Structure formats: C-alpha cells, structure tokens
Amino acid sequence: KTVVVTTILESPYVMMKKNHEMLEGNERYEGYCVDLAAEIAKHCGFKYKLTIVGDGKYGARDADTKIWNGMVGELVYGKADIAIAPLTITLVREEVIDFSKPFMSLGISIMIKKGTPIESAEDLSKQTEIAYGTLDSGSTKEFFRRSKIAVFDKMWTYMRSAEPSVFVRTTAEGVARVRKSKGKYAYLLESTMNEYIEQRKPCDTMKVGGNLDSKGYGIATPKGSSLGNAVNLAVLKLNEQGLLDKLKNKWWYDKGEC
Template sequence: GSANLKNKTLVVTTILSNPYCMRKESAIPLSGNDQFEGYAVDLIHEISKSLGFNYKIQLVPDGSYGSLNKLTGEWNGMIRELLEQRADLAIADLTITFEREQAVDFTTPFMNLGVSILYRKGTPIESAEDLAKQTRIKYGALKGGSTAAFFRDSKISTYQRMWSFMESARPSVFTASNGEGVERVAKGKGSYAFLMESTSIEYVTERNCELTQVGGMLDTKSYGIATPPNSPYRTAINSVILKLQEEGKLHILKTKWWKEKRGGGKCR
C-alpha cells in the first residue's frame, strides 16, 4: 500500500553524470545536498515538495549504475544500495531493463530515449543503414555499455553487420567514456561516428555546434526512479511523476538543463 511520507527522511542514491547530477561550482566548500545540481537533483526536489518528505543525496560508493554478476548472483552500483537498504530511492539516468526489474521496482518513466548516431554536420550520412553500407567512415560506442550491448544482441541484420564491423576494427572504435567518443567525432573531420543515447547526443549538440544527431532512434528505452522491491513509496512517487509530466514540468526541467545551463543553447 502507499505510505505516509510526511517528514520522513529518505536516502537517495545517485551518480555523477551530466546533466543529471553534477558537482556545483563554488568558491566555498559546500556540504550535504547543496553540493549537487542537475536534472535529477531538481526532480527529487519537486517530488519531495509534493509529498512532504526530506531527503539526503549520497553518491553511489562504487560509481556504478548497477549490473548483475552472473556467477555470484550479486548486484553492484545503485541497485545494490537499494537491495541492501542503504538507500530508499535511486534517481539518475538509470535505464529500466528487464534484468534490473527482476531485482528492484521502477516508477513510471520520467524520460524516454534511444540509441542514435553522433556525427559531424553537413555529410551525406543520414541513417544507420548508410553507415552500415560503407567502411570508410568508422563508428563505435562506449566499451561495455548498454549501446554496445544493443548491437551485440540485436537480431536485425543491419545492426549485426555493424557489430561485426565494430568488433573487427583496428585500431579499436570503442571508447573508455562518452566524452572520448564525442572528442573523436569532433576531431575526426568526418572519419568517425559515435553511437550513444539520444539524450546524451542532444546535450552534446547544444554545446558543440559542429556536431549533429544523424537519423532517428534505433531502439527505445526509459529512465525511471528505482526503489527496493515492494517499496511503500513507489505508488505515491508514480503519481507525482505523472503529474509533473502532464503539467509540462518535466519538459521545463529538460529545457533548463539541456539548453539553458552550463553552456547550453549556444548552437542555433
């Protein structure tokens, strides 16, 4: 059932990731929740205002989102924090997946996205099919991330072909971070395209005017707030997310952090 949240203090686990949760730039040392800002930080603020609870933001100690070790059956990251009851909520760019849904509960999504292509402006490439048809322009993804897994596990022949191409490419087309991938596209003068989540691509193209998203989304997924299994708070939080969605508040928050803050909106 739903629980009364009034004046309770909930522990929120999150992870540093632009523009969801970032360290606030400040000349003086900041403590507690004041250290952080971003979309996820504003989102928990809105939800807490609506339901009347307090909260304490804590960065996940191992710096991971949460994956299952198939051998030990143990989770790491934010998922583990919830399972071991060190946190009541996980709020981040945390993708709702089948595997994670087996372990924790998710709220209704607050953001939808999909894999897409980051490339330089003014080129004849218009889709994944165009990339797959040629070998001159190299393309890659974050090593070991969900985008790479999407290609690895795809049953669609175009994406299977792209995966073989990526796997066999030397030097490697995989990167250690999204930032490295973005830099490679920017410096590559059209010789490299990077596959990543559309939300991240939008963030980058607001700040680097030579880059653009090519084609649409190759899959669809969502970010949601995670709670421990059978959390009494999930139903109440669901209602607030739906309300924020319908009032256009989620859209306003996205515009704020993508287009207005921290160097956004300079590409027109």
C-alpha cells in the same frame, strides 16, 4: 529516515556546481535530476541525501560473478534507497528493481562530428572507415548485443571485435573521441544526451537519423520498496503538470550555447 539517493555525474542531469567546494550536501550539485530529486522528495514527503554512484556506472550484471554494478547494484545490495538518474527501464533490470513509469522518453541515436558522411545506422554498418561505439556498460551496449535485426547485428559484430576498443567508460569520453577524431569516430548514445551535446560549444557535433528504438528512463527503487508507489504517482503528477517538459527546456535549450 533520510532517503539515500544514488545518482550519476552525467551532464546535464547531475553536474558539479561551480563553487561546490564552498557548499554542502545536496547544494553541491545542479542539473535536471537535481531539480527532479528535490521535487519527488517534496511530493513524497521525504528528506534525502544525494550520493554519486561509487563505480560511476549505470548498472549491469557481471556474467561470470553475477554481481550487479552501478546504480542498480547500489539499490540491489541496499546501499541506496532510490536512484534518480537517466537510468533506462529495461527487462533485466525490472526483474531485480522497481521502476516508476518513465519521466523521460528517448531512443538510441547517432552522434557525428559535423561533416561526417553518415546519415543512418545502415550507413555505419555498410562501411569501415568511420569507427563507432557505445558506452561500455549500459542499455545501448546491450541493445546491440541482443539485436536480431540484421543492421544492428552487423554493427554489434564489428563493435565487439573492433580493436582498439570502440566502447568508452563515460558519455563525456565518447563525446571527446567524436570531437577529436576528425569525423573518423561516430558515437551511439541516447537521443537525450545527443540533443544536449548538440547545444554545447564547440557546437561541432550533431545528431543524425532517426531513433533506433523507443524507451524511457524511470526512477528506480529496490524491489518491494515502501517508496515505490508514491514516487510513481509523483512522476505522473509532475509530467501532467508540465514540470518534466519545463525541466528539459531549462537544461537543454534555455541554456543552449549554439
């Protein structure tokens, strides 16, 4: 009856509300995905419960164990009915879960501490002074692991063998490493998160160069779910009405601190 929604604490998508300890259920959270969940639910005609993914991950299949972790895993093993998060539509995921058409368009980009002598991915690859990494488990990490393009293969080769590790557990961890490294650490993350951080105090980071690829985030459901068709139509209806753009403006730029 009540649709269990799996999501992830990733700003500005889902964040803990100021006085959440005094609130209950869905009212404990706020963010772009919280506003979107409320809308997809209204339009699809269902009651839901927001749940933060237990392992705090997006979703990857473990090569040795074959188990799916993160939000994807919660959908695959039936722990959740739908995932409303900045979850990238990829081929390996679409083979096990269903995705609506994209609700947000993005691409991998570079986050530097202001003043870092880096203008592109080619620049990162051609040097060693400045370290660079990605989110440990996710679509960005896989983009480099599977890239046939020379510049990205070179970047991956360095990243996988770099010590100490250049990969981080969460986006926030990557952002702090950038901020605390005096320009000695650049971070590869999706343009959406980069643009969000670029508008947050201490206003010391910046997105550089173009996007490395083009892709989208989709609302995910288990393969052959009943909700699939309706949520896809809701995403299309809401994009066409201007809500998705309105929501990105609200959480990224309207509340900008820089």
